[PDB]
């Protein structure tokens, strides 16, 4: 939910959604990377969780909608940047 | 020239020889503008003959610019100041030298610092030779004032001197102090971490400590009975840092394509 | 080749985009495999961009 072009979530929420002893938290957190629910790293000198990958949301109409808008934003970036670079080095092309 | 008295001869004498009468001046201000047709005829058509003439013509015009400070007519001073620029050096030699050339230059140079036309102070200076004959007692206050300011000294940027004529000189001293202090205050904002109440006079170049506190609400310097202005100011200055992808010396994408193109 | 890639990249993004709108309303059949793989592109999000520069050529021309 919170990452999708952001990537951090705080470490702190996990323990608030665990509610169990502190030593047991490290195990849970690490167990999640391992099974294939998530990929990423945990940084405990900032006490935040960085995720490289967050697992895709199992079939819904909603999952399709989230993707479309972000991708459209990106579509606009390619076209603009492509034309820009083409003007200069007009001579090199030939 | 000398020609048509009561706005030639009389104008000179009221500042100098006689005692200033502002009432008499006010009406001569309108009259003086008419006379400029004959006066500025001597500069910008100069010749060897006109060398005696130029001096006489200058006296009415320059005293009349000095009087404009005294009337509190800043636009009328600017119009006349401008014509006088041509007289600073004109021809091969016309003799710029006058007895009130020295009085005129003192007020001119001061006006330039007050405004914070520091550039104009330098640019007019190189043009001025004809002020060496005048000597520096009235001149000595703006040249020195500028130098000390440049240096960073806050105890040599005196306004003690420069009131030796003082018929229109006091006006520049009052404003100069105020403009310069503000600039000194910007300096201090970056310069120094905390000011209590008793070292503030000198450092700010402000008049009182009371005043340092007053501006401490205005520029949000205050934090306790002493200021903490330095922290925020000091930290901003680094800009030597470079964030991933050069955009400091143009964006990386455009720059990288340009290197290819030059070939 | 580089400008050919860039145009080729723009054409690629549009096929996928147009298709998601159609799923969103006015239903087309979908697969679990395609939908997941697309999500992944957002999640992978690059890190930081650095390095690479030249200037070598001017000496060659100058000596010539």
DSSP string of A40-94? EEEETTTTEEEEEEEPPPPS-HHHHHHHHHHHHHHHHHHHHHHHHHHHTTHHHH-
CA distance B205 to B212: 10
The 3-state secondary structure of B78-132 reads HHHHHHHHHHCCCCCCCCCCCCCHHHHHHHHHHHHHHHCCHHHHHHHHHHCCCCC
Phi then psi for residue A10, to 5 deg, are: -80, 150
How does strand A38-43 pair with strand A8-10? unpaired
Distance between CA atoms of B171 and B169, rounded to whole angstroms? 5
> Does the CB of C52 have a partner CB in chain B at under 8 Å?
yes
CB nearest C39 (choices: A61, A67, A81): A67
Task: Order across the sheet with A8-10: list the strands.
Answer: A8-10, A48-54, A38-43
Residue B61 exposed, middle or buried by CB count within 10 Å (0-12, 13-18, 19+): buried
C57 touching B, CB under 8 A?
A: yes
State the CB neighbour count (10 A cutoff) for residue B181. 19
| Separation CA B62–CA B220 (nearest Å) | 45
User: Can you tell me the distance from the alpha carbon of B104 to that of B196, in angstroms, rounded to the nearest whole number?
Assistant: 43
Q: Which positions in chain A touch C28 (Cβ < 8 Å)?
A: none
> How crowded is the C-beta side of C64, counted as CA atoms within 13 Å?
5
Measure the CA angle with vertex B144, ends B140 and B150; round to 5°. 160
The answer, for A2 touching chain C at a CB cutoff of 8 Å, is no
- Report d(CA B244, CA C48) in Å as an integer: 6
Strand A48-54 relative to strand A8-10, pairing:
antiparallel
Radius of gyration of chain A (CA): 20
Cross-strand bridge partners of residue A41: A50
Nearest CA in chain B to A91: B261
Quote the CA–CA distance of B201 and B197 in Å, as a whole number.
8
- Structure tokens belonging to residue C7: 């145009």
Query: Which one of A5, A72, A93 has the shortest CB-CB distance to C42?
Result: A5
Distance CA(A63)–CA(C36), nearest Å, equals: 9
Distance from CA of A93 to the nearest CA of C (A): 9
Residue among A94, B257, A85, B259 at smallest CA distance from C58: B259
Smallest CA-to-CA distance from B130 within B58, B201, B63 is with B58
How many CB pairs below 8 A link A and B?
A: 19
**Do residue B252 and residue C49 have CB atoms under 8 angstroms apart?**
yes
Tokens of A19: 């509610």
């Amino acid at each position: 939910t919170r990452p999708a072009n952001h990537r951090q979530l705080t470490f702190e929420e996990i323990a608030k959604s665990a509610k169990i002893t502190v030593n047991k938290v490290e195990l849970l957190v690490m167990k999640a990377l391992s099974v294939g629910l998530v990929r990423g790293s945990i940084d405990e000198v900032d006490k935040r969780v960085h995720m490289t990958w967050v697992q895709p949301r199992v079939l819904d109409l909603q999952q399709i909608k989230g993707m479309k808008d972000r991708l459209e934003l990106w579509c606009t970036d390619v076209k603009s940047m492509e034309l820009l670079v083409e003007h200069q080095a007009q001579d090199i092309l030939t | 020239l000398q020609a048509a008295a009561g706005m030639y001869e009389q104008l000179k004498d009221e500042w100098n020889r006689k005692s200033p009468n502002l009432s008499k001046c006010g009406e001569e201000l309108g009259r003086l503008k008419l006379v400029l047709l004959e006066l500025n005829f001597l500069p910008t058509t100069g010749t060897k003959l006109t060398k005696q003439q130029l001096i006489l013509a200058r006296d009415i015009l320059e005293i009349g610019a000095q009087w404009s400070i005294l009337c509190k007519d800043i636009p009328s001073f600017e119009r006349y100041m401008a014509q006088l620029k041509c007289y600073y050096f004109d021809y091969k030699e016309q003799l710029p030298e006058s007895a009130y050339m020295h009085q005129l230059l003192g007020l001119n140079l001061l006006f330039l610092l007050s405004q914070n036309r520091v550039a104009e102070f330098h640019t007019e200076l190189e043009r001025l030779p004809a002020k060496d004959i005048q000597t520096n007692v009235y001149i000595k206050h703006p040249v020195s004032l500028e130098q000390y300011l440049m240096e960073g000294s806050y105890n040599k940027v005196f306004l003690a001197k420069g009131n030796i004529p003082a018929e229109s000189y006091t006006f520049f001293i009052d404003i100069l102090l105020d403009t310069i202090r503000d600039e000194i205050a910007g300096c201090i904002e970056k310069a120094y971490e905390k000011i209590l109440f008793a070292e503030a006079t000198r450092i700010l170049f402000f008049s009182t400590p009371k005043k340092m506190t007053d501006y401490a609400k205005k520029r949000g310097w205050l934090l306790g009975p002493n200021n903490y202005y330095s922290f925020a100011s000091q930290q901003q200055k680094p800009e030597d840092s470079t964030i991933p992808s050069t955009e400091l010396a143009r964006q990386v994408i455009e720059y990288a394509r340009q290197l290819e193109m030059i070939v | 080749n580089q400008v050919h890639g860039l145009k080729g990249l723009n054409s690629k993004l549009l096929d996928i985009r147009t298709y998601l709108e159609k799923v969103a309303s006015g239903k087309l059949p979908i697969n679990h495999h395609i939908i997941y793989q697309l999500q992944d592109v957002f999640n992978l999000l690059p890190d930081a961009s650095l390095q690479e520069f030249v200037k070598a050529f001017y000496l060659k021309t100058n000596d010539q």
